[PDB]
Design an enzyme around this catalytic site. Sequence first.
Site, PDB file in Angstrom:
ATOM      1  N   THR A 159       0.788  -1.256   0.000  1.00 29.60           N
ATOM      2  CA  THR A 159       0.000   0.000   0.000  1.00 29.60           C
ATOM      3  C   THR A 159       0.803   1.281   0.000  1.00 29.60           C
ATOM      4  O   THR A 159       0.671   2.105  -0.928  1.00 29.60           O
ATOM      5  CB  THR A 159      -0.976   0.026   1.209  1.00 29.60           C
ATOM      6  N   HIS A 309      -2.531  -1.753  -6.027  1.00 30.64           N
ATOM      7  CA  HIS A 309      -2.032  -3.154  -6.251  1.00 30.64           C
ATOM      8  C   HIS A 309      -3.262  -4.066  -6.241  1.00 30.64           C
ATOM      9  O   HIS A 309      -4.367  -3.633  -5.900  1.00 30.64           O
ATOM     10  CB  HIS A 309      -1.034  -3.612  -5.163  1.00 30.64           C
TER      11      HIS A 309
HETATM   12  C1  LIG Z   1       5.161  13.672   2.005  1.00 29.06           C
HETATM   13  O1  LIG Z   1       4.459  14.373   2.958  1.00 29.06           O
HETATM   14  C2  LIG Z   1       4.405  13.655   4.162  1.00 29.06           C
HETATM   15  C3  LIG Z   1       3.334  14.392   4.963  1.00 29.06           C
HETATM   16  O2  LIG Z   1       2.837  15.454   4.541  1.00 29.06           O
HETATM   17  N1  LIG Z   1       2.987  13.792   6.191  1.00 29.06           N
HETATM   18  C4  LIG Z   1       3.498  12.462   6.647  1.00 29.06           C
HETATM   19  C5  LIG Z   1       2.344  11.466   6.912  1.00 29.06           C
HETATM   20  C6  LIG Z   1       1.245  12.135   7.816  1.00 29.06           C
HETATM   21  C7  LIG Z   1       0.032  11.295   8.088  1.00 29.06           C
HETATM   22  C8  LIG Z   1      -0.857  11.734   9.097  1.00 29.06           C
HETATM   23  C9  LIG Z   1      -2.065  11.083   9.310  1.00 29.06           C
HETATM   24  C10 LIG Z   1      -2.437   9.956   8.527  1.00 29.06           C
HETATM   25  N2  LIG Z   1      -3.686   9.348   8.728  1.00 29.06           N
HETATM   26  C11 LIG Z   1      -4.041   8.312   8.008  1.00 29.06           C
HETATM   27  N3  LIG Z   1      -3.194   7.750   7.019  1.00 29.06           N
HETATM   28  C12 LIG Z   1      -3.768   6.619   6.259  1.00 29.06           C
HETATM   29  C13 LIG Z   1      -4.004   7.097   4.778  1.00 29.06           C
HETATM   30  O3  LIG Z   1      -4.092   8.316   4.515  1.00 29.06           O
HETATM   31  N4  LIG Z   1      -4.066   6.144   3.780  1.00 29.06           N
HETATM   32  C14 LIG Z   1      -3.943   4.671   4.010  1.00 29.06           C
HETATM   33  C15 LIG Z   1      -4.302   6.559   2.376  1.00 29.06           C
HETATM   34  C16 LIG Z   1      -3.140   7.261   1.759  1.00 29.06           C
HETATM   35  C17 LIG Z   1      -3.387   8.286   0.797  1.00 29.06           C
HETATM   36  C18 LIG Z   1      -2.334   8.853   0.086  1.00 29.06           C
HETATM   37  C19 LIG Z   1      -1.029   8.404   0.316  1.00 29.06           C
HETATM   38  C20 LIG Z   1       0.011   8.999  -0.433  1.00 29.06           C
HETATM   39  N5  LIG Z   1       0.860   9.503  -1.023  1.00 29.06           N
HETATM   40  C21 LIG Z   1      -0.767   7.391   1.276  1.00 29.06           C
HETATM   41 CL1  LIG Z   1       0.874   6.795   1.382  1.00 29.06          CL
HETATM   42  C22 LIG Z   1      -1.803   6.806   2.046  1.00 29.06           C
HETATM   43  C23 LIG Z   1      -1.882   8.298   6.744  1.00 29.06           C
HETATM   44  O4  LIG Z   1      -1.131   7.723   5.897  1.00 29.06           O
HETATM   45  C24 LIG Z   1      -1.511   9.479   7.535  1.00 29.06           C
HETATM   46  C25 LIG Z   1      -0.296  10.177   7.352  1.00 29.06           C
HETATM   47  C26 LIG Z   1       0.778  13.472   7.160  1.00 29.06           C
HETATM   48  C27 LIG Z   1       1.972  14.419   7.123  1.00 29.06           C
HETATM   49 CA   LIG Z   2      -3.013  -1.095  -0.566  1.00 27.04          CA
HETATM   50 ZN   LIG Z   3      -3.666  -4.972   1.888  1.00 27.72          ZN
END
Ligand SMILES: COCC(=O)N1CCC(c2ccc3ncn(CC(=O)N(C)Cc4ccc(C#N)c(Cl)c4)c(=O)c3c2)CC1
Ligand SMILES: [Ca+2]
Ligand SMILES: [Zn+2]
Length: 805
Positions: A159, A309
Amino acid sequence: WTATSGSCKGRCFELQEVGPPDCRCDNLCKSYSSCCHDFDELCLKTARGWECTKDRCGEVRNEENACHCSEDCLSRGDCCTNYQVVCKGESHWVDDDCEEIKVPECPAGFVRPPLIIFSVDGFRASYMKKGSKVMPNIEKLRSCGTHAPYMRPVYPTKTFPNLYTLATGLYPESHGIVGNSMYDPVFDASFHLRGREKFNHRWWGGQPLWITATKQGVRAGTFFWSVSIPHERRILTILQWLSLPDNERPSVYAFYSEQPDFSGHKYGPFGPEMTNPLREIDKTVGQLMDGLKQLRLHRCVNVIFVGDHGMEDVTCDRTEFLSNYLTNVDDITLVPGTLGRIRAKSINNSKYDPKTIIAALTCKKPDQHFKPYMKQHLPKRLHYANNRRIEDIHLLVDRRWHVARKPLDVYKKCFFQGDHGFDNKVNSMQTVFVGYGPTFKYRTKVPPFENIELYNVMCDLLGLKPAPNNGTHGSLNHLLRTNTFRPTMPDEVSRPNYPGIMYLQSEFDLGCTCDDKVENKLEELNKRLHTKGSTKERHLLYGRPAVLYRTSYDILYHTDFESGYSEIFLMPLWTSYTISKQAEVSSIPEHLTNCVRPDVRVSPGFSQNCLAYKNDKQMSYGFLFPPYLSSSPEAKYDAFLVTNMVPMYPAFKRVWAYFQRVLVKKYASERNGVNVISGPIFDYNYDGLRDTEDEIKQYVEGSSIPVPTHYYSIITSCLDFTQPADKCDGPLSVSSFILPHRPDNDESCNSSEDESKWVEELMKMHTARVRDIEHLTGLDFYRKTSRSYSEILTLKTYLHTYESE
Ligand SMILES: COCC(=O)N1CCC(c2ccc3ncn(CC(=O)N(C)Cc4ccc(C#N)c(Cl)c4)c(=O)c3c2)CC1
Ligand SMILES: [Ca+2]
Ligand SMILES: [Zn+2]
Ligand SMILES: *[C@@H]1O[C@H](CO)[C@@H](O[C@@H]2O[C@H](CO)[C@@H](O[C@@H]3O[C@H](CO[C@H]4O[C@H](CO)[C@@H](O)[C@H](O[C@H]5O[C@H](CO)[C@@H](O)[C@H](O)[C@@H]5O[C@H]5O[C@H](CO)[C@@H](O)[C@H](O)[C@@H]5O)[C@@H]4O)[C@@H](O)[C@H](O[C@H]4O[C@H](CO)[C@@H](O)[C@H](O)[C@@H]4O[C@H]4O[C@H](CO)[C@@H](O)[C@H](O)[C@@H]4O)[C@@H]3O)[C@H](O)[C@H]2NC(C)=O)[C@H](O)[C@H]1NC(C)=O
Ligand SMILES: [Ca+2]
Ligand code: NA
Ligand code: NA
């Protein structure tokens, strides 16, 4: 610490995130447990559900409701998505005929068509056909817009690496998100999906689309969502942001769905329980399109429907245990599951040996469902080595299987029936791409392509200049009606020399011998013409490759082949030759078995020598143009020139000789001729990029002859196989490989058998794109063809995968 005693009044789903200890009201505050005291009450309304009914039409506004059916709702931007359908006699978007969107049809104040990215977790490519009867909204996007039959994810097919690749156009080794679980040896910290650690920005490299847009004055927030915000509320939030004033409104939006992945892990990819989640995702697309239609944006916005995926059948009982192979299983740490990554338990342990771990895991059981690799030995197509978070030892797991350390890891956590993470060429891991809108083409099917290419296209869709990335900009121009980027060929940096005959035989002291003294104006002018480039149009079909760095090299012409010979590396950078369907295979004559001949066009000081090979007890040699494919017994002497020789381990020569003697001719028969370009690759620091001279770690003993890490070939023919390779009027067809130059065949468990039982399988595993070879060599191919440059760029990104249909 948060002073949660502030308020979200007038701030629900605010775009600018505010800094602690002040409380937050944005779409991520739940993940951080930092929302203001009244966030649920004000921002997560649920009263009366998500749909208008007849009795609600023209109601008096009640601000407690989840969404509205009052007369003022369109101007407030907060109607339920079905409001016009229930209360104004409108049709659902899905029930409307499809009509070509020739130009954007946008409300006044819209500067550009917005982009909405709708990402679906675990959406396997074959769902589009197999679930089509229960997904009418998705089926309409697909049939009316632009679609691929499938899109290739990045490795590992997990993911977080794939979602962040979609956002950056980078390989996981470059963006830094190398798994769903990762350990960083410098941070002494582990990144997991569950936890606060992932919130730290230190993990996240490259430049995602939202930052690219913001820097260039196009408004965009992050693409993340807190899990507990329901899908209906995510959609209503997007629609409300779209009703903001011109100066305040974003131009790019992201919706994310945890389904169908969530249920797929529980029930398997095609479990009967899977029908309902696909229905629910289709309903959500329907809500979005109905909402856009209400706002008169359904012929203005570009929509991308995209997966990260697929999903494979995987159960507890199909688990290989490392405790069954190793005795010291408590001295290791394993990242387990659909891939394996192994490191030492303690860094104070100098009695930890990767060599012994690899040996104890190699071909140990006859049905063995994984294969160990040092990371630099993984197929180059995976681009999975140049990062400190990727462990030296890698396990590639068979589809349908898991790897674990010890049995107790599996029962002390059968639960699950589905999983993903395997090799990105596996059919079950393929995912989906659909583009719909004014900027995409109408009712158009495109070939499969890699998710690394999408960042550039999304930048094109928004009028942005992309940050440096791993896409090939122009390779997806065929997806777009307009906003195409105009790619141009890179300029050649080094011009070749064309040497004539400059040296007498006796000036060479190379320790080489050949039985060639066995000796006509008819056929002497003839061979003079060949040395001058008279057959060059036959053997160099697409122009000479351009050299994109500063170096010293010579073009050498022959009857049967042409080469670009490096005075620095003492061997060709490329060798090009054409083999017709009618070509014949012959042997190396008895008297020529050990023949090597000085080349009178090239100085002794810029040649290899036979003595070094004699002395180097590990290293032997092969030839780039194969002697087996000579056009005549006289032309065969050209193949034994010292300028056609390359260093080869005897174990590798078994592979190479089988390819040259058996497989080239088989491909020529099947494809109606082939053009072949072959050469060395040096990548000692496993960065996917051509090594400079001072990066070479191994030479032929007591010489300056550098040892390649890999050997490549690019095999081109006519897409219309009724035309021969050397007289093709239309599109081209290519397959390529990058074979590791190894001193053993430990990778191939069946290597004690005849080459016909294992060599082709190895070659298939090490299939490659032309673009991968270009990165590894600093060469630019297909410079002179009759085809458009955008089409050539698509051809250079092609990967021949050797999967079924
Ligand atoms: C690159 O910037 C990093 C950044 O801005 N930060 C670091 C990370 C930080 C942060 C804070 C709270 C969060 N709450 C839930 N989820 C789950 C969540 O969204 N999905 C499972 C969906 C998803 C959608 C787009 C991308 C991309 N592309 C990814 Cl990979 C995952 C976080 O991943 C999440 C991340 C937010 C601040
Ligand atoms: Ca996934
Ligand atoms: Zn999965
Ligand atoms: C896929 O596409 C990508 C993107 O185009 C390609 O990757 C680029 O490759 C370039 C060549 O290797 C590389 O350029 C170098 O950048 C150095 C500056 O690096 C920082 O700045 C950039 C730009 O903002 C930033 O993006 C970098 O981010 C990396 O590092 C952080 C962690 O610190 C991570 O968060 C992030 O994920 C990313 O990690 C990845 O890249 C690094 C390498 O930078 C890897 O080690 C990681 O494992 C991971 O893959 C950086 O924050 C710059 O210093 C370099 O210049 C040196 O080399 C030249 C040679 O020409 C020399 O003349 C200079 O003097 C200089 O030498 C100095 O540094 C030496 C090394 O420390 C030292 O020995 C000397 O004394 C000197 O002081 C160089 O220009 C570029 O950074 C990456 N970009 C990214 C985003 O990865 C990739 O190649 C493509 N893949 C294929 C197969 O085509
Ligand atoms: Ca390199
Ligand atoms: Na030798
Ligand atoms: Na073997």
